[PDB]
Design a protein around this nucleic acid. Structure first.
Lengths: 233, 251, 56
RNA sequence: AUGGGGAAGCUCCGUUUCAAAGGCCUGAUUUUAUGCAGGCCACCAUCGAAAGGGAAUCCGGUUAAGAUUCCGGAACCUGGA
RNA sequence: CUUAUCACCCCGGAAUUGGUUUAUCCGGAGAUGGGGUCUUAUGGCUGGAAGAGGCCAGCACCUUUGCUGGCUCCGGUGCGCUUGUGACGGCCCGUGAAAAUCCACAGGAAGGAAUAGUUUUCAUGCCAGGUCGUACUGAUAACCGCAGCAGGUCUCCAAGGU
RNA sequence: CUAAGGGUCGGGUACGAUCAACUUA
RNA sequence: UUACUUAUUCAAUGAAGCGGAGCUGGAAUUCAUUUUCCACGUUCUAGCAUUCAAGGUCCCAUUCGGGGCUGAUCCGGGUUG
């Protein structure tokens, strides 16, 4: 035990070989990594028109979860359920002589941007969610303004992937409800009031609000250095 | 007329520099981390003659702060530097001949050489044999330092630009007459193909603006505008004055 | 010649001292004197700086 | 050459550049040889000398003509369990 | 196996300064002197290797073939010629490639006890070393100049006398 | 014909045979 | 003329240490525990500096000996001008 000793090395300017540290801050990230960062930075340093910044202005995850809990009970049919219902229908038309009315009417979340926009134009939308991760914002920019003038409740929601999972896809950019069963008409009405009070009723206030203009970490530090130098006396 | 001799130099076929025997680009070390918050010591292992350069060069071995490796650097040798000598590079390096202090760290009147034009360019000014830079003064607000260049020009640059304390070695080189075309021959064969020089007036008009005539004579004024084009810029280019310089120029 | 050092025995290429085949006797001797004396002087500078820890 | 950038385009520049450009030891060692936590990097193409640098051969004999190559002796170097 | 100028080590410690080159450099940072390693630098001896090769003498007497006997030994000389080497000295505002490749050193990861572990940088032993070139001329006739043209075309060796 | 000019040793505390080559006059 | 930087431009690096908060102390020193900035503890000398680092503190069948944290402060990922 006395055979040990205390070496300690000095990490001064020219004293010892510097230890291996976390150089993760100074990584020469690949080209595609660099674009992703500087693209998000550019979209935050610029005056983003109020058409944007109403996106990335979503509801809390507390609200998002309680919508989905209602939504998953109305998730559409799958390939497995279609096949088991198609042959059930085909067997039924012979035995019961029904005009495909033996199969029930689905109560399904109605997805698809072109379908949903037609839903909003016809007023057939009881509730519409919009994604914020649609990389060309052009496809969804008019959606809040479309949902407003037509008077349908809409919420801007986090996750185009979460929308894709809801509709058995990878991405959907919109989800919507048109008709809810008689058992839980109460749940939607209670939930729509919260959404209306959060997005649609503040739409005209969001229409004048610009985002962006935020500067970098070292930019704000210099900005505060202007303030403290000025206020010092 | 044909393309003239000074026009043909930009193609760089036979007018590229003869660089076989050179010891590398003489540069200060990279301004990395140590040079700007402390100093780093190194040893000059040899001072060697660089072909085509009047000034000697110094080979200096620094240690790598981040890895176990000896990093060699090719400094321009300042007068008095000897093999076996320590030279200290950084902001906290002492004001000694051979040290690589930033310009802002040295007092007024410091004699520096191989000075950076910008911090980190590894040295641009006062690099030829017997040349130096003087520190005229400092401007700490908007951190700067004004210096006197070998040509006499005044220049203000950032105080972080580094330089070697002292004067380049090999000074007094041009004090000896070459005495012989052969000595001028050997001088330029390790530099570039710029020698000998035929006068333009001894050419034909196809070859030079000065060529031709029943006597050897320029014929038109040898002072040429700055806005003249290539093939025309032979003589004294954009000359403010001409003739034997008498008196001073307030230098 | 450089390649014939591959087939010759170790005794020929070296000598029986520290740094034997790369630095001659007087250089390694100078390195030995230098190494000991600087480290000895380092302990001297270490205690000269250490007195201020007793002073304060 | 590539990366990349010009050029309507044949092509031009560029040669490490604003590129995600890297082996060897009992790792593992029985659907196994990469099904699976075993390190060092910071290499950046390639072509360009029959007078430059280079691993190692000599003597004697032999033919119509070859020989430091064949033959007889006598060596050396490189790779390989 | 042995053999060196240079270089280096140990030991008295030097002015009456000494040693010393053709050339004047070196010595208390240790001279002179006395003792001391290695590079087939280069030479000598031995092995190779006299059995080879060369010079004489004698037998073969039409199987496109040999056999025998000797000798091959000692030296000397030099501003000699040429080439190589060495230690030097002169020159330059000229200071007179690169890489492959090979080794060495620093270091201290790993591994080592019932016939074992490592040494395959010691000696000896075993196998392989492919491909393409290889004749000849190289010039008053083998190349180019319309040609077997008094022209042109790079280089090595270099006897005696005056 | 003459003269001059060199190399190689055994030291009781000035001595010789050997050997040698072309430069001068 | 300017209280800017992200567009564009320039220069380096194997994009290694940037901007703040700061941890014991120095200071022409506050009138109520932090209101700036620095050693982040290397300059006689042609030595040395590398093996997740030695040490230190809690843990393990301390079976090729190991793990975590800290030595080497935290926060922001703008590589730096």
């Amino acid at each position: 035990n006395p055979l040990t000793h205390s070496t300690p090395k000095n990490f001064g300017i020219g004293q010892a070989v510097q230890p291996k540290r976390n150089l993760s801050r100074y990584v020469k990230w690949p080209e595609y990594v660099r674009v992703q960062r500087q693209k998000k930075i550019l979209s935050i340093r610029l005056k983003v028109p109020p058409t944007i910044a109403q996106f990335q202005y979503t509801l809390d995850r507390n609200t998002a979860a309680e919508t989905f809990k209602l939504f998953n009970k109305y998730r559409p049919e799958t390939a497995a359920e279609k096949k088991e219902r198609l042959t059930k229908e085909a067997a039924a038309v012979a035995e019961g002589k029904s005009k495909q009315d033996a199969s029930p009417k689905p109560y399904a979340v109605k997805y698809g941007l072109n379908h949903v926009v037609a839903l909003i134009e016809n007023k057939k939308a009881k509730l519409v969610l919009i994604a914020n991760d649609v990389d060309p914002i052009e496809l969804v920019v008019f959606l809040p303004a479309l949902c407003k003038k037509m008077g349908v409740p809409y919420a801007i929601v986090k996750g185009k992937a979460r929308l894709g999972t809801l509709v058995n896809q990878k991405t959907s950019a919109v989800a919507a409800l048109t008709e809810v069963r008689a058992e839980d008409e109460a749940a939607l009405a209670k939930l729509v009031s919260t959404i209306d009070a959060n997005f649609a009723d503040k739409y005209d206030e969001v229409k004048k609000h610009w985002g962006g203009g935020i500067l970098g970490n070292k930019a704000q530090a210099k900005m505060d250095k202007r303030a403290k130098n000025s206020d010092s006396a | 007329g044909r393309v003239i001799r000074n026009q043909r130099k930009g193609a760089g076929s036979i007018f590229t520099s003869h660089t076989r025997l050179r010891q590398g680009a003489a540069k200060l070390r990279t301004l990395d981390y140590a040079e700007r918050h402390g100093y780093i010591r190194g040893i000059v292992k040899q001072i060697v003659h660089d072909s085509g350069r009047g000034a000697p060069l110094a080979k200096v071995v620094f240690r790598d702060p981040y890895k176990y490796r000896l990093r060699e650097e090719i400094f321009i040798a300042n007068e008095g530097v000897h093999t076996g000598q320590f030279i200290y590079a950084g902001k906290k390096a002492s004001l000694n001949v051979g040290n690589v202090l930033p310009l802002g760290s040295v007092p007024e009147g410091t004699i520096v050489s191989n000075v950076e034009e910008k911090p980190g360019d590894r040295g641009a000014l006062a690099r030829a044999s017997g040349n130096y830079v003087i520190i005229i003064g400092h401007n700490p607000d908007e951190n700067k330092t004004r210096v006197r260049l070998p040509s006499g020009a005044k220049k203000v640059i950032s105080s972080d630009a580094r330089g070697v304390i002292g004067v380049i070695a090999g000074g007094g080189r041009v004090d000896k007459p070459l005495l012989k075309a052969g000595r001028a021959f050997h001088k330029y064969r390790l530099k570039r193909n710029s020698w000998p020089k035929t006068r333009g007036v001894a050419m034909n008009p196809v070859d030079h603006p000065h060529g031709g005539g029943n006597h050897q004579h320029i014929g038109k004024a040898s002072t040429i505008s700055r806005g003249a084009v290539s093939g025309q810029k032979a003589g004294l280019i954009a000359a403010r004055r001409t003739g034997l310089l008498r008196g001073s120029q307030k230098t | 010649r450089p390649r014939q050092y591959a087939t010759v025995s170790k005794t020929h290429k070296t000598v029986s001292r520290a740094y034997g085949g790369s630095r001659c006797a007087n250089c390694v001797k100078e390195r030995i004197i230098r190494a000991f004396l600087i480290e000895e002087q380092k302990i001297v500078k270490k205690v000269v700086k250490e007195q201020t820890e007793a002073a304060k």
